[PDB]
């Protein structure tokens, strides 16, 4: 797994789970969603509702303050988003939609209107029209070709053309079709409900050639100059012709995408065949069938695929990259097929983590930082974790099902909250489509508006974290960390927390500076670790540890991997305006990195308390580690305590980048996150405490922890807000 999942709820920082500026247009979104890049370098998001009666638009980089527009439709489209198109013509979002009754609706939405404050819209922003009789021959797929021309596909197998004469009116330009004549055979009828070989995917090549994929997996190719069938390939008669079962595709989906003159096609054989040839002159020429690596019966459905230029992956042997998004229920799967060379015979499948760190930690009870105790403490915890949109949707579902909080301390209620919150989140995060943010940034758009998932290329350390129970090889450092995790994973959460606390205590002086390091480690050991682990695992850890050259590995870990670089500014494109998207993506990514760092650092420190490692030789490392552990803890605490505030102080930390950043590739993003890491390990805490004072229970531990004169003051006032206050 070379990529990780970073989840983004664009409204997370704000209390209102809805933008104040929402406008409802009417014509006389949890079923499809996508992003589209516009002339102004902005991404517009759109959602088509379950019923296909509501279309919603909102600006990716300004969801809360920007305008979201709901366009209400008189009836549903004939066949969902598949009978809908959206393209930017000239400073306008042109949207066409064949409705159920047969009408062909046109929408014209000025770009300005999409980024204005206005709640009104002038002029003819919509046109109804009946160019063809769709009662008899029902369409199911609408494909945009040009501002004036676009084709319609029909359920029975026929194509209709649609040519724009003036600015509004459309007329049918019919294609010659003699396929139907297979009705003459005893094996097909015109009247039969089966037998249809309708189009399920379609792409435009060089403005002129129209490549269509049919339900029987025929690749037909139409020349729009001639309006004539030029090619007809049977994709299946190439590979092992299975007489048992080839699943004729029973719905429109994303079964092909082309880059330059290459073309991948998705064929169903255990839902596992990526054919890919080349287009050239028109001739399609096969190269290879690349199967999938999917098990659990192979029960994943394609959501979206995107063939494109190669990424910066851990195998330099690369020529092209296919990004692939599967789904199974609300569970998703992101993979990248890397093809090495111009022969499509050498390739490699690259998997990714399909759950975010926060989620994995919550599931596997690996979260050490989140404060325990009170029921209302848990309330703040979940509220802060999930965001208001989810938390309130969950409280809605609770009261609907007649689950009502008995009293202040109803733990039985909170229990229910955990799950409903998780489920709501999971639902909201159901995958719908892929967007290539920037040049190469893999973005997934979810069913619930304001919910996106970015898939981020992992750094070295992140790859180690995410592949402990996998990596066959690995460097010495990986193996060392792996063995440390091998021991530490046997300890329980309470023990680990008490140890973390003690490491804070060394810094706060609660473990007096008067003590030697050895004495503090002995204290820690006796109070926290003694009788709390199996001696067999200790022996194991010691043995494995003796194979390593510890000073070197620790050197590489501390001074290269974990301690970031001095920058002479390496272009983190300065944002002119606040970008809520990159803001939350940055904060979540930072949180993942520092969480991983935290777990490593703690495991190493643990090894320093357990064994007789010369406290003088490693003194430098020990104190650096305790400093880093301390800073990590602090940051993570502030993160789950008040994300908005943290973001605000962490971006008002960098002067030249006060408004935020833009990143168009993975390198710029990684470098920016690293930059923030640097900020943390080296003004934030002050701006945060200040803005906060102008999260009460918080800064008690965080004036016991994050305090260690000013600290006394803060403790004295937060405790006034009484004997302790006056005394201090």
């Amino acid at each position, epitope marked *: 797994a070379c990529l990780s999942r970073i989840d983004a709820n664009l409204l997370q920082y704000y209390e209102k789970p809805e933008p104040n500026n929402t406008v409802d247009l009417y014509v006389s979104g949890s079923e499809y969603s996508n992003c589209l890049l516009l002339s102004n370098s902005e991404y517009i998001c759109y959602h088509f509702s379950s019923r296909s009666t509501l279309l919603t638009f909102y600006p990716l980089s300004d969801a809360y303050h920007g305008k979201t527009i709901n366009i209400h439709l008189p009836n549903a489209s004939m066949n969902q988003r598949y009978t809908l198109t959206i393209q930017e013509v000239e400073q306008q979002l042109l949207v066409n939609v064949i409705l159920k009754d047969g009408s062909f609706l046109t929408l014209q939405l000025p770009l300005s209107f999409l980024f204005s404050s206005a709640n009104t819209l002038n002029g003819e922003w919509f046109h109804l029209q009946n160019p063809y009789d769709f009662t008899v021959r029902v369409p199911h797929f609408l494909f945009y070709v040009s501002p004036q021309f676009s084709v319609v596909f029909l359920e029975d197998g026929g194509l209709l053309g649609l040519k724009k004469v003036d600015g509004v009116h459309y007329e049918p330009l019919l294609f010659n079709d003699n396929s139907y004549l297979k009705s003459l055979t005893r094996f097909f009828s015109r009247s039969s409900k089966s037998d249809y070989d309708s189009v399920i995917s379609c792409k435009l090549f060089h403005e002129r050639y129209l490549i269509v994929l049919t339900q029987n997996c025929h690749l037909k190719i139409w020349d729009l100059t001639s309006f004539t069938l030029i090619q007809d390939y049977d994709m299946v008669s190439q590979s092992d012709s299975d007489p048992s079962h080839f699943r004729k595709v029973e719905a429109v989906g994303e079964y092909l995408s082309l880059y330059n003159n290459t073309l991948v096609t998705l064929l169903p054989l255990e839902n596992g065949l990526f054919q890919m040839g080349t287009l050239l002159v028109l001739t399609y020429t096969f190269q290879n069938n690349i199967p999938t690596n999917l098990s*659990a019966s192979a029960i994943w459905s394609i959501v979206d695929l995107v063939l494109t230029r190669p990424l910066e992956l851990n195998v330099e042997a690369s020529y092209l990259n296919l990004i692939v998004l599967w789904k199974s229920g609300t569970a998703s799967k992101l993979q990248i097929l890397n093809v090495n060379d111009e022969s499509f015979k050498n390739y490699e499948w690259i998997e990714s983590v399909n759950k975010s760190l926060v989620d994995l930690q919550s*599931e596997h*009870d690996l979260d050490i930082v989140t404060k325990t105790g009170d029921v209302e403490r848990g309330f703040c915890n979940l509220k802060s974790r999930y965001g208001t949109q989810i938390f309130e949707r969950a409280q809605q579902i609770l009261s609907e099902n007649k689950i009502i909080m008995a009293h202040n301390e109803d733990e039985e209620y909170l*229990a229910n909250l955990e799950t409903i919150l998780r489920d709501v989140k999971t639902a909201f995060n159901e995958a719908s489509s892929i967007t290539l943010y920037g040049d190469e940034i893999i973005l997934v758009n979810c069913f619930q508006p304001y919910n996106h998932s970015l898939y981020k290329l992992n750094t070295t350390v992140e790859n180690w974290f995410y592949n402990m129970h*996998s990596e066959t090889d690995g460097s010495e450092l990986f193996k060392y960390l792996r063995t440390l995790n*091998g021991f530490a994973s*046997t300890l329980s959460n309470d023990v680990l927390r008490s140890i973390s606390k003690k490491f804070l205590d060394i810094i706060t002086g609660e473990l007096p500076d008067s003590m030697t390091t050895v004495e503090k480690f002995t204290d820690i050991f006796k109070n926290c670790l003694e009788n709390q682990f*199996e001696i067999t*695992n200790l022996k*194991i850890l010691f043995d494995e540890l003796n194979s390593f050259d510890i000073p070197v590995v620790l050197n590489d870990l501390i001074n290269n991997q974990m301690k970031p670089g001095i920058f002479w500014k390496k272009d983190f494109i300065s944002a002119i305006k606040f970008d809520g998207f990159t803001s939350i993506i940055s904060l979540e990514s930072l949180h993942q990195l520092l969480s991983i760092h935290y777990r490593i650092t703690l495991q190493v420190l643990l090894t320093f308390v357990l064994f007789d490692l010369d406290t003088e030789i490693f003194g430098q490392h020990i104190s650096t580690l305790l400093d880093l552990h301390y800073k990590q803890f602090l940051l993570l605490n502030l993160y789950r305590q008040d994300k908005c505030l943290l973001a605000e102080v962490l971006l008002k930390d960098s002067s030249e980048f006060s408004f935020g950043v833009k990143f168009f590739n993975y390198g710029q993003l990684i470098a920016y996150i690293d930059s923030l890491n640097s900020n943390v390990y080296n003004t934030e805490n002050s701006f945060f405490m200040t803005f906060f004072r102008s999260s009460h229970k918080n800064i008690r531990f965080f004036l016991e922890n994050v305090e260690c004169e000013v600290q006394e003051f803060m403790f004295a006032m937060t405790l006034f807000s009484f004997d302790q206050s006056y005394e201090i």
Partner: antibody
Framework: VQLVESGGGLVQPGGSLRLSCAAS????????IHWVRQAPGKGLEWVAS????????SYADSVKGRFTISADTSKNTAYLQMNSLRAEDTAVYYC??????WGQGTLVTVSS | DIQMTQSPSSLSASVGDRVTITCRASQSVSSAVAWYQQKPGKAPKLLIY???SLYSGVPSRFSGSRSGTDFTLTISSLQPEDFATYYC????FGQGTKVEIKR
């Protein structure tokens, strides 16, 4: 793919038995081997596991100090050495790996 | 030690009936919960892992879900080959739900 379990049977109480579980058709060296037992007419009881990958072992309270789990990666074989056996230890023991792959199980009678 | 309760301890149902088996954790285990089916005289077969993931090859009539500390195994349409003892698991196991084909 198949686990194999040999070495149970009848054993006098206070006595000893070594169970073997010979594995194949998966990566033994990165798997975890568990031993799970079922007393006549009762439910499943997890007693022990070992990480091939790091040797890490652990035990249910009911068997700690009497049972030793071990593993030889070079013959893809794991072991459970059972000492000071008790009537409470009769049952059928399985061997599972992580639990996707299960031993056909071998029955251990402690009595006389 | 964690205690996994199951309810009911023994149920009975028609072929084609929808069957619900519940499991309650003594403490609060996270979604680290698996469901197994055991025929008598044979090794348990994994059905569900991570509370709601369907294990490879298992019929889709079996599903798992969670509500707080309550875990649910559902058989959407009971078949005559489905009589068995079903177990939840977090390591500790449930006491075991025994189903048969009600008459």
């Amino acid at each position: 793919v198949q686990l194999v379990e040999s070495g149970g049977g009848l054993v006098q109480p206070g006595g000893s038995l070594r169970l073997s579980c010979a594995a194949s058709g998966f990566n033994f060296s990165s798997s975890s081997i568990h031993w799970v037992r079922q007393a006549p007419g009762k439910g499943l009881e997890w007693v022990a596991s070992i990480s091939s990958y790091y040797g890490y072992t652990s035990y249910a309270d009911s068997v700690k100090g009497r049972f030793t789990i071990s593993a030889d990666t070079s013959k893809n074989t794991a072991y459970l050495q059972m000492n000071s056996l008790r009537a409470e230890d009769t049952a059928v023991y399985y061997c599972a790996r992580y639990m996707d792959y299960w031993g056909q199980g071998t029955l251990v009678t402690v009595s006389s | 030690d964690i205690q996994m309760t199951q309810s009911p301890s023994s149920l009975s149902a028609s072929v084609g009936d929808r069957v619900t088996i519940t499991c309650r954790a003594s403490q609060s285990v996270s979604s680290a919960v698996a469901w197994y089916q055991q025929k008598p005289g044979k090794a348990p077969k994994l059905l569900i892992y991570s509370a709601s993931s369907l294990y490879s090859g298992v019929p889709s009539r079996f599903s798992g879900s969670r509500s707080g500390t309550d875990f649910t195994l559902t058989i959407s349409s009971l078949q005559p080959e489905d009589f068995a003892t079903y177990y939840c698991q977090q390591i500790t196991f449930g006491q075991g739900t025994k189903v048969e084909i009600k008459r």
